[model samples]
Target: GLMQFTLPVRLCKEIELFHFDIGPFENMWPGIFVYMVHRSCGTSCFELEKLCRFIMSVKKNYRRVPYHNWKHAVTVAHCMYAILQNNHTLFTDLERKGLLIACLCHDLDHRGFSNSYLQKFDHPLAALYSTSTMEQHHFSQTVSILQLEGHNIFSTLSSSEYEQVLEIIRKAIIATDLALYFGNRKQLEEMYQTGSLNLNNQSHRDRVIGLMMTACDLCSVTKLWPVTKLTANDIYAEFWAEGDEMKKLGIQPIPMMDRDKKDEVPQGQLGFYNAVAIPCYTTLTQILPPTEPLLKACRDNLSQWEKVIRGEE
Candidate 1:
């Protein structure tokens, strides 16, 4: 029985240089990572840089790996990168940079658990952020750290440019919430039907940025099949581990964790992916073809897991 968990010693050293370890994936290409980050952003670069620095600094402060580590950041950042690779004409250099950098830093200090963790712990992030859509404090804290007298990221931008960059960063980061998986579908539909680029108008840009981030987050459902499978395995493992933790603490299981004694964990996950995730992401493929392969990976995994649960694997 694993009572207390040890934060795995990260393989990458540059991670400690950042402020927090984004996990192993980010430890790859440290110099390239920092430079690419700077090249894409504008005024918000100040905020982004400050956030990056803080992420590097926090390594010694937090004893455990917070869920929002560099891996998640890099994952989302890469997703944003993939999205832009297809729609380069849509974004200005700075907007593209903002989208990428914002995604990487969005969950900087995150604890890997949901806002439910904050609710459980009476953490200040939740109290100060107060449940704005997608746990707004995640965005505000990242942004606020930049505005502190010496820590501002958009400091390099003109006043107007700074405002614009912040808006892009804010919208892109907040939309990564998984809870929005369905809601985002409704939004993209609305935007599509309206036939608007929406990037021109301030409000429109915010909406577009939000939708774009959501699209990229879901884009993984269509990546290379093996990579998709590995990521799916990771998600399932995390969910199960969390459930085990809850049981040890004598707390009721959360939604993803609440399987009946007769029901196997893998079966519950299959139902989740098939019923909820598949349908949602399948719809996403209509707008982004890259998602189709990932969806196929989900289908493939669904079958494999189903078989193994029945002892076929």
Candidate 2:
């Protein structure tokens, strides 16, 4: 038998009346995301309501983990919204919608386990995708959510635009993987240095989208120090929990994921900033000056981590 569900009127009202700002954690992401999309893409009232429903559905699909939950989804989507608004003409209308939707759904249905854990445990998801396993699942789950009745917010688009948007969303979601970000960063840096980063070129545009996805995925590190440290610890909570589980199975967790080595968290985060997060925002800031605050915030957090490493915290 088929089942049906709907959000309560009070909850719906709360979401619909939500607003966005830089401070405080907000839970009304459905309204916030849909509002941004409507303004940026010019959707009709009917389309906006449909998008609200779609985003609520997507938000509900996220797991109740320490991190990678609905809050993380909304935070990434908000960063994408900020980026798109800061450079309104950087992407086409379809591309804007694609990036917004992709950001909101990038970590859909995450299970609080890393891809390495899945592979080591012989999880079915590892067998299914063979590559970008979690990212593929996230995108597939997003498509599943979109396929629901009254949930196709992109139904307003023509067939060609719909396909193109989906294509971009697929790549953007998969690009959330750090493995993909490394290569995208190299190409982006090369293009920027050579003054060859032509947004008009499909290849160049796609690469930018990939890098942007990474930027949004790691948006926490670019936040104020308090926010960054809070989200970072939340992420490690999820990581350590996975390690704790691995211990029960008689398997040794990797160094980064190992719960017992909690003391290394500071150094680990320092390495992350030095190697990945700092360079990412640095490249993005060079390409998009509006993104300079992200680099600045990352460096600030890196300094804090350095203090902690040196016993000054």
Candidate 3:
């Protein structure tokens, strides 16, 4: 599945919607969220490819890294477009490029488990550089990986341009840290409210940076039928697998996965669907048409979830 990377036809349609000609690079940014970053940050094809490859790579955890993996990255990238369509006034060329790059590399080197897992394990990454912010450390590792001497994509830009792009990418990606969720939401909301430009070809990069990242990070709850359901299961499985590992280490599992009642996964699924996913995407679609499918998908998925939760599946 990792090797089945195909360019997004929907996104290509989007490019055409904006009247831009990308020539044959249609498949370059296969994911909408990734393309949003490309548009926001001017990330070269090389940098973007590298980021995608890293997401596809295997991890030490038997499972592929979940939150920081390709599916998550792609979904997040797609969310950026959904949000942008809702508020087209934002998104400068430079900002679009930055946002795309940020989304691509946001969880570049993340291990499967979250920061909470790192904290519980006394991992070295959580110790020295991370201090109290393991997510920051993981983000830095990806940035550092990108900044390798001759391999640095940033080196392709002039100093000022490089700094401008790097600053925004860093800001948006780092904001994904769950530790700063409220702070990030507040900051992005501020950026959204401040963008009131009514020009037909407006390109406000900073707002795109803020809005795209936040939207994508929370976007999956709104994805399509089988796609949405598959993703929900994938995420739950990864979480449960990690929680199981933690259980072996005598650590407490998160409430979502009831090891005692492994069959209760269905219950967990419904809870996430009804409480978190549905409401979030429904509101998003009311404001942005591109994301309406997400709401539809959520409603459809809820029926399935309800059935599964009731042991009817």
Candidate 4:
């Protein structure tokens, strides 16, 4: 078993649910994980405590980078939590568990760089996985975390169930790749357009789960303005840092990565929302009607970004 930390005072309280922006990042996940596990699997107190310890271990492994750090993990996981809470019947118990866990571990051990950056620099992880390399590394790291002693919270599952859960987690985590998201968005859009998205079909459900993983991953874009701005700043800070690194190597960064083009951030975000973020949420909402609020929020953010681009704010 992984080493344990003294349970936080907050974790001891009975929490019915969590608001994504409220609570300490470290305290938030264990409570949500414990709550979800208990609801889905009826885990005993001892098992829940062990699960908390395991979650803490995973949280500790996250680097202190600007964007892909513990805070981002908590945010993504909480988004999944929020979604599951609102739409409990959307997925089966096993699928719910897989989605939540995958969200938490999606960017485990992220090196504050993108797949393109890794490949450009000839990084070892890039060489190892080839396609969707960074996402694959994140999934592998997630499995490694689960394999660690005491961290295998899924230990209680039957062998077959355990393997099924792991496979779901693998697909969910890899689905976070933006490269994959584009294809997923297209598939999902067409399915919804043709009214062929059948949740009862395991294969179709798997595709929905993958898309939900991405919706949750990009949840920040659908948050309130204050949180959206703050998260954007944090993410771009990381992007600028990568740009700084590349500059030192005498490499030119794309405008988004380049700090010198700060004025273009609003325009960039507008384009992203129109081409990527908006389409994602719009497609997700078509399949998961409860997710319409996400699309609405994204549209709100798009309006705000447009204002910024027009110097209206």
Q: How far off is model 3, as Cα RMSD?
A: 7.1
lDDT of 1 at 64: 42
lDDT of 2 by residue, 47-66 (tens): 65677688789878998899
Q: What TM-score does each of the candidates earn? A: 0.68, 0.89, 0.67, 0.89
| Model 2 bad stretches (over 4 Å) | 1-27, 43-46
Give candidate 4 misplaced runs (Cα > 4 Å). 1-19, 23-29, 36-46
- The alpha-carbon lDDT assigned to residue 307 of candidate 2 equals 91
Q: Residue 124 in model 2: shift from native, Å?
A: 1.0
**How do the residues 32-67 of candidate 4 rate in per-residue lDDT, one tens digit apiece?**
565555554344523655567778878888899988
How does model 2 score by TM-score?
0.89
Q: Write down the RMSD of candidate 4 (Cα, Å).
A: 3.8
Poorest lDDT segment (10 consecutive residues) of candidate 3: 54-63
Model 1 stretches astray by more than 4 angstroms? 1-26, 32-67, 132-134, 144-153, 190-205, 218-226, 229-250, 258-263, 279-312
- Provide backbone clash counts, one per model: 20, 0, 20, 3
Model 3 lDDT on a 0 to 1 scale: 0.55
lDDT of 2 at 35: 58
State in Å the error of residue 22, model 4.
Answer: 3.5
C-alpha lDDT score of every prediction, in listed order:
0.56, 0.81, 0.55, 0.78
Runs in model 3 lying further than 4 Å from the true structure: 1-63, 81-88, 129-132, 182-211, 278-296, 310-312
